[PDB]
């Protein structure tokens, strides 16, 4: 299939949330972006067959000047036989530059070098902007303060994600991302947060990295497997279960917005000796439509 | 009850040491073992054959001429004492940190004087003090103390209360790091473990098993007789701090205490299944517990069953919000003795196994049950929003409302407030109410804050001290007559704590008793001494244990007590240990999760480079403790406070002009600052000092921080 | 299909603009600033709220207001058509203020003479300097191609009121007066012709 790197440079502060409005996150999983893509394709009156049948995206990872970051793989690192706080430094570390990814998979990285890699990330700063609600003041009430957490990417930094699919799927992705540049991604995109510009191009470096074949597999997107594959993939695996929850965002779902069914997915960067392909899990209950949660798997091979 | 006799004798094998040191209460002029045997024979309940045999004969010469029947507890006590251990009457207890980090910072001369700090000056424990301790021990053993399992737990608490500051080895040449209580507790734990191992092995004669040729002694030391077991709870900090709403600022400490009591209940259940006391519990801190167990097949089966039961319970109640992982490694007696230098290797291996278990925490069926949900919640709790469980009225979950209901003993009974594993409930009860619950409900464990199992945890909360402040936990702190109404959040952390445990102790000094002493010292500092440090300040401590701290309160009180905490930690550690702190200032109604996360970011910033650093407020203000205590506050902030409090306006307009000029690096801005200082009409020497501080980088930042602190100090 | 009318312009402060922040250093009544560049901004929240309030006063919740600014009531779930981004301190004004050695913000000193003791109570508020210009970026979502003209008439009315009104701060005391300058109005997504469309 065709692989395209999409680089997102954000012109405005961005509100990515995990559980609350005040919480600000620097990245979004693949499920959030797939929800945005489905919403956009519905707005643009476009078919959902390509996205639901062949699109394979990853999460959004940091990038900066001359470095593209990948999730820290969940491998058994030997550390230093002297100190245990080296493992603390490794757990604090979260993202590895693409150049150092193979080295980290082969060890060869000290705890001090791990902290250096962690601090080498040049991805913006998060803040908490406090706003008010004045709608109660007209009918004999008080102003209600409330905080929104936002994230400001540094001028040459931003997010990126790889996308794999057919030529037609890649074209639909290009059109939908062009529309999404102005639709915005985030949690307050109707109040200014999340305006961005995307650039979609084929990357030789990342294509070569994906072409690399190793003994183990690494998840690049928040994914989960069905029972037939879950009985086999879990053997000798190091993963992390993320609790994907959220409210439904759509006018036609119900008279009032209600929560989705709680989902659990393998975080990006988990290590599996056996590879699995995810499914688009339906997380709606008794709804007018079916809410889609993305759990397909984008695999990066590695040597440990 | 032979196991109970063995435990009673093992814990009390070195009791005669105190009397033999006293030399003032009918000195027998004999071996400390014989004096202890006589002392136990004084009391009829303790006159049991096992106890006196264990006390009298726990050394090679005594055992050779013991003339006791085979399969006796004296041999077990002897070998356990030998494993744990591996003569001036007045020898001070030596600070453990003297040995710690000796390869780099040398060996210290700190000695405890008969909570206390090492005074660093040599002092001799008066024999009269030993005699007074012997008299108190005699009186307590006469009536208060008894014989039995619960009596054994009470005896362990009494031993911790008395012998915690009495040296284990009376010899002055031998290092006095391990105290008598630590050595006795480790001896009791090892004796219980070897007794279980031999009972599983069905050893007919104990002396033939280990003593008769004395080759079998080293053979037994070679055998993998023990297990080092670690339980770790994941999700503690996320559970405590990820809460939203006006009730979070009062539910914080309740959630933390609930988690600590849940861990204590878990380890108590584990010990009860294995039929062991809390002596086997080597350490328990921030969600982490280390224990020593027998290597019997029954012990491994109990560990597997306990792991399965706890995983199932935590999945049923919290569903990935909290988990507990338990991993064990087989341990050789020589490893505890560190003869081969394999003690730290054993600990690191068990930690690696624990981490590996944390990686693959959930099984196939558990994941399948997680993903398959019937219906959406359609209603969630205001804090820790969970749709799965039935949300009651006012939008509070069953756990969430119980934690609200909790907010002086803790009772783990069939009926209570908050669910606890093995189908129990935790409820805070009055002493008489707790006793009533014990009488009404059999098998009811009760914990006493700082049949009661004494639990050490820092509970300092200034709000609960005053009835008006009892209503609002922290909004009581924020209100001030003068000074900006803000909150100070302190996230402190001991740096290289794992390195201190592993590399801090030299390989020649590594042992099980040494590690127990070090861990007990750390816990005793961070649970009991912390409250005495924080006395008189508007600070409430949410978490403790060194590896993680949290002290929320007024910003100025928080920074002052952080300085005092650094001074006290320097005194107690006597060097060899530096802790990095992050301090943040936030308005009231600021999200709790945001406060915790941003102060954690500040702490992470302070951990960089040299770890002896404090990251104050904004991330650009990362200083050293000496820099902040003296240069920022005492050298600069105090003279400015004097000069401006002399003025009628208290500044507040001059300071902002100063800050605006200091933000710029223009030379003309330096000239403008000179003119502003000239017009301000300060003292000329202070004016020149301020100008020079502004001229010199790394002093301009200190001046700016002093100015900002002064501005926050006076805010109408 | 779906259309996104992209409107780009400049907001020129006519008097000092003070959009405060509840949460650089100790500043008396600071204004909101960009976390990275530390340049004052106009949050899209403030513009959206002021425009919605002025449209509410003019029209009068009303169906046009909910259609434009979005609503989330039961049976009244409508996506906001106006996505108003933050107004960033412009580069041209940044250079103009770099020249003349002029700071981007200023400190206004005020009083409050008590009716009881006639004692002036000093106060300070930060205000963006009156020469500043903020680049503003608005997106209109054409959900109904029939209602778009009426929506833009309402938007023009809101902008007219806002130009005669104030933006965030104490406007009745002279702060916050602005002026919009619509540099362009373009339909980036879709094909809805907005050449005849024009605010102001």
The candidate with the shortest Cα–Cα distance to B400, out of B392, B411, B408, B409, is: B392
Q: Which residues of A touch B244 (CB under 8 A)?
A: 20, 22
Residues in chain A: 304
Chains in touch with A (3+ beta-carbon pairs under 8 Å) read B, C
**Count of beta carbons in the 10 Å neighbourhood of residue A145:** 12
Burial-class residue B149 by CB neighbours within 10 Å (0-12, 13-18, 19+).
Answer: middle
Residue with tokens 């301009």, as numbered in its chain: B700
Q: Quick one: three-class SS letters along B597-624?
A: HHHHHHHHHHCCCCCCEEEECCCCCEEE
Q: From CA B614, how far away is CA B599, in angstroms rounded?
A: 11
Q: Do A262 and B502 touch (CB under 8 A)?
A: no
How far apart, in whole angstroms, are the C-alpha atoms of residue B325 and residue C199? 63
Q: Give the number of other Cβ atoms within 10 Å of residue B642's Cβ.
A: 11
Beta strands in B502-624 (DSSP E): 539-543, 550-553, 579-587, 613-616, 622-624
Compare CB distances from A85 to B376, B496, B591 and report the shortest one's residue.
B496
- Strand, coil or helix: what is B637? helix
Output helix, strand, coil percentages for chain C, rounded to the nearest 5: 25, 35, 40
Question: Which stretches does DSSP call E strand in chain C?
Answer: 3-13, 41-42, 71-73, 76-78, 82-84, 87-89, 105-110, 123-128, 133-142, 178-189
B642 CB-near residues (< 8 Å, 6+ apart): none
CB A181 within 8 A of CB A198: yes
Give C-chain residues touching B659 at CB under 8 angstroms: 25-27
The CA–CA distances, whole Å, from A199 to A25, A160, B61, B96, B652 equal 22, 9, 84, 61, 50
Task: Quote the CA–CA distance of B177 and B168 in Å, as a whole number.
Answer: 8
Rounded to 5 degrees, φ, ψ at B587 are: -70, 165
Resolution (A): 3.1
- Inspect the interface and report whether the beta carbons of C79 and A190 lie closer than 8 Å: yes
Which 3 state secondary structure label does DSSP give C70? coil
**C-alpha to C-alpha distance for B241 and B591, rounded to whole angstroms:** 10
Q: Residue B130: exposed, middle, or buried by beta-carbon count in 10 A (0-12, 13-18, 19+)?
A: buried
A150 has which bridge partners?
A127
3-state secondary structure of A303: coil
Q: What is residue B625's three-state secondary structure?
A: helix
Judge contact between B95 and B110, C-beta under 8 A. Answer: yes
Nearest to B503 among A82, A147, A149 (CB): A82
- In terms of Cα–Cα distance, which of B58, B284, B87 is closest to B187? B58
Distance, CA of B120 to CA of B122 (rounded, Å) = 7
Report the 10 Å Cβ neighbour count for B699: 18
Chain B neighbours (≥3 Cβ pairs under 8 A) are A, C
- Chosen for mutation from C1, C2, C5 (greatest number of chain A CBs closer than 10 Å) is C2
CB neighbours (10 Å) of residue C35?
17
From the number of C-beta atoms within 10 Å of its C-beta (0-12, 13-18, 19+), residue B653 rates as middle
Candidate from C23, C28, C101 with C-beta closest to B656: C28
**Interchain CB distance below 8 Å, C189 and A178:** yes
Interface test with C, best of A126, A130, A184, A191 (most C CBs within 10 A): A191
Report how far residue B575's alpha carbon sits from residue B101's, in angstroms, rounded to the nearest whole number: 9
Handedness of CA B318, B319, B321, B324 (dihedral sign): positive
**CB distance B419 to B435 below 8 Å:** no
Show residues of chain C in contact with A192, CB under 8 Å.
Answer: 43-45, 48, 83-86
Separation of alpha carbons C110 and B600, rounded Å: 39
C-alpha to C-alpha distance for B333 and B81, rounded to whole angstroms: 12
Contact A41, A176 (CB under 8 A): yes
Is A178 touching C (CB cutoff 8 A)? yes
Q: For residue B586, which residues of chain C lie inside 8 Å, CB to CB?
A: 23
Q: Is B457 helix (H, G, I), strand (E, B) or coil?
A: coil
CB A249 within 8 A of CB B366: no
Q: Which tokens belong to C116? A: 């009881």
Angle, helices B512-524 vs B343-359, to 10°: value is 60
Closest CA to B124 of B23, B13, B12: B23
**CA max distance for chain A:** 68
Q: By what technique were these coordinates determined?
A: cryo-EM
At residue B557, the 3 state secondary structure works out as helix
C-beta atoms of B604 and A92 within 8 A: yes
Does A127 touch chain C if contact means CB atoms closer than 8 Å?
yes
Please tell me whether residue C79 adopts helix, strand or coil conformation: coil
């Amino acid at each position: 299939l065709v692989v395209k790197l999409v680089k997102l440079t954000f012109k405005s502060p961005v509100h990515f949330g995990m559980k609350r409005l005040s919480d600000s996150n620097h990245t979004i999983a693949a499920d959030t972006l797939f929800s945005a893509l489905i919403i956009e394709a519905l707005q643009q009156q476009l078919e959902l067959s390509h996205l639901l049948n062949n699109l394979v995206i990853t999460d959004l990872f940091p990038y900066n000047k001359t470095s593209y970051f990948l999730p820290k793989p969940l491998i058994r690192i030997e550390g230093k036989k002297g100190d245990e706080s080296g493992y603390k430094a490794f757990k604090k570390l979260t993202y590895i530059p693409v150049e150092n990814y193979s080295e980290y998979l082969r060890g060869e990285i000290d705890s001090l070098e791990a902290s250096k890699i962690a601090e080498s990330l040049n991805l913006g700063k998060a803040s908490l902007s406090t706003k008010v609600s004045l709608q109660a003041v007209d009918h004999n009430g008080e102003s209600e303060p409330y905080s929104v957490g936002n994230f400001t990417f540094y001028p040459e930094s931003g997010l990126y994600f790889l996308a794999k699919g057919n030529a037609d799927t890649i074209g639909q992705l290009e059109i939908l991302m062009h529309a999404l540049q102005y639709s915005g991604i985030g949690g307050k995109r109707s109040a200014g947060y999340g305006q961005f510009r995307c650039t979609i191009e084929d990357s030789g470096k990342f294509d070569s990295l994906l072409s690399q074949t190793g003994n183990i597999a690494i998840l690049l997107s928040s994914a989960m497997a069905s029972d037939e594959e879950l009985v086999d993939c879990l053997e000798d695996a190091r993963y992390l279960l993320k609790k994907r929850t959220g409210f439904v965002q759509s006018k036609t779902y119900a008279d009032q917005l209600v929560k989705k069914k709680d989902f659990y997915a393998f975080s990006a960067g988990s290590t599996f000796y056996q590879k699995f392909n995810g499914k688009i899990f339906d997380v709606s209950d008794n709804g007018r439509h079916s809410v889609y949660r993305y759990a397909k798997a984008f695999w990066l091979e590695g040597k440990i | 009850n032979k196991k109970l006799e063995l435990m009673y004798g093992s814990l009390l094998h070195d009791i005669g040491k105190i009397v033999y040191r006293s030399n003032s209460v009918d000195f027998a002029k004999g071996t400390h073992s014989k004096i202890g045997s006589q002392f136990l024979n004084k009391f009829k309940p303790f006159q049991l054959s096992g106890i006196v045999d264990s006390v009298s004969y726990h050394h090679y010469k005594e055992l050779a001429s013991s003339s006791l029947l085979d399969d006796s507890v004296a041999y077990i006590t002897y070998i356990a004492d030998n494993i744990a251990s591996g003569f001036d009457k007045r020898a001070p207890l030596a600070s453990i940190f003297n040995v710690v980090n000796s390869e780099t910072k040398g060996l210290a001369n700190y000695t405890y004087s008969f909570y206390r700090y090492p005074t660093d000056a040599k002092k001799e424990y008066t024999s009269s003090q030993y005699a007074a301790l012997v008299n108190k021990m005699t009186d307590d053993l006469s009536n208060k103390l008894k014989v039995g399992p619960d009596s054994f737990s009470s005896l362990l608490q009494w031993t911790e209360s008395l012998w915690s500051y009495i040296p284990s080895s009376t010899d002055t040449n031998q290092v006095m790091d391990v105290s008598l209580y630590d050595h006795s507790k480790i001896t009791c734990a090892i004796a219980s473990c070897i007794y279980d191992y031999l009972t599983e092995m069905n050893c007919v004669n104990y002396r033939k098993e280990l003593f008769s040729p004395y080759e079998k002694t080293k053979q037994f030391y070679q055998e993998d007789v023990f297990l080092l077991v670690s339980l770790d709870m994941s999700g503690i900090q996320d559970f405590i701090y990820n809460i939203s709403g006006s009730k979070a600022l009062k539910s914080l400490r309740s959630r933390s205490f609930y988690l600590e009591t849940m861990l204590e209940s878990l380890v108590d259940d584990l010990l009860s299944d294995l039929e062991l006391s809390r002596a086997n519990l080597l350490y328990t801190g921030g969600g982490h517990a280390y224990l020593l167990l027998p290597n019997t097949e029954r012990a491994r089966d109990v560990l597997a069953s306990f792991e399965g039961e706890m995983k199932e319970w935590f999945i049923k109640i919290f569903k990935t919000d909290l988990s507990v992982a338990i991993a064990y490694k087989a341990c050789t007696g020589e490893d505890l003795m560190n003869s081969n230098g394999t003690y730290s290797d054993l600990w690191q291996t068990v930690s690696r196994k624990l981490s590996d278990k944390k990686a693959h925490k959930y099984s196939l069926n558990e994941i399948k049950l997680f993903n398959s949900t019937i219906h959406a919640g359609t209603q969630e709790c205001k804090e820790c929003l969970r749709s799965d469980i039935d949300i009651s009225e006012d939008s509070l979950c069953k756990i969430c409302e119980g934690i609200i209901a909790i907010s002086s003993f803790f009772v783990v009974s069939p009926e209570g407030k908050v669910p606890l594993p093995r189908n129990r409930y935790l409820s805070v009860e009055n002493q008489d109410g707790a006793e009533r619950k014990i009488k009404m409900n059999k098998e009811t464990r009760i914990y006493s804050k700082n049949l009661v199992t004494n639990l050490w945890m820092c509970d300092y909360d200034f709000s609960t001290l005053n009835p008006e402040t009892k209503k609002q936990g922290i909004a009581s702190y924020v209100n001030r007559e003068v000074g900006i109404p803000r909150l100070g959040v302190l996230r402190a952390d001991i740096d290289n704590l794992g390195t201190t445990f592993i590399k801090g102790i030299p390989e020649q000094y590594r042992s099980i008793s040494r590690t127990a002493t070090l861990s007990r010292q750390l816990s005793m500092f961070f649970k009991f001494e912390l409250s005495n440090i924080l006395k008189g300040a508007r600070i409430s401590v949410i978490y403790s244990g060194g590896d993680d701290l949290f002290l929320i309160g007024a910003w100025d009180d928080v920074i002052s007590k952080a300085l005092v905490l650094r001074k006290a930690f320097t005194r107690f550690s006597a060097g060899k240990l530096t802790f990095s702190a992050g301090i943040g200032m936030y308005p009231v109604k600021y999200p709790i999760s945001k406060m915790a996360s941003e102060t954690g970011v500040l702490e992470d910033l302070a951990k960089r480079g040299e770890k002896n650093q404090v990251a104050l407020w904004n991330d650009s203000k990362v200083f050293g403790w000496s820099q902040l205590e003296e240069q920022i506050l005492k050298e600069k902030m105090i003279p400015l406070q004097e000069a401006l409090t002399n003025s009628q306006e208290h500044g507040k307009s001059f300071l902002y002009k100063m800050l605006e000029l200091l933000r710029n690096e223009d030379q003309i801005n330096i000239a403008r600052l000179a003119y502003l200082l000239a017009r301000s009409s300060l003292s000329e020497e202070l004016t020149q000092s301020i100008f020079a501080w502004s001229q010199n980088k790394q002093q301009k930042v200190e001046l700016i921080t002093a100015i900002e602190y002064l501005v926050y100090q006076i805010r109408e | 299909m779906y259309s996104k009318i992209r409107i780009v312009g400049k907001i020129d402060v006519l008097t000092g603009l003070h959009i405060g922040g509840g949460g650089i250093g100790a500043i008396a009544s600071p204004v909101v600033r960009d976390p990275y560049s530390r340049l004052p901004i106009i949050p899209g929240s403030s513009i959206k709220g002021k425009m919605r309030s002025l449209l509410a006063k003019h029209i009068g919740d009303a169906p046009e207001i909910l259609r434009l600014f979005g609503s989330s009531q039961k049976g009244a779930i409508q996506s906001s058509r106006l996505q108003i981004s933050d107004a960033f301190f412009s580069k041209a004004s940044q250079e103009e203020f770099d020249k003349k050695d002029l700071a981007y913000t200023e400190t206004k000193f005020e009083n409050t003479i008590s009716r009881l003791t006639a004692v002036a109570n000093p106060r300070q508020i930060e205000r963006v300097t009156r020469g500043a210009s903020f680049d503003f970026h608005i997106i209109y979502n054409v959900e109904n191609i029939n209602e778009v003209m009426a929506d833009f008439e309402n938007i023009k009315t809101a902008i007219h009121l806002l130009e005669n009104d104030y933006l965030g701060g104490g406007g009745t005391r002279g702060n916050g007066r602005i002026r919009f300058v619509i540099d362009s109005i373009d339909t980036v997504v879709g094909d809805f012709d907005s050449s005849n469309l024009s605010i102001k």
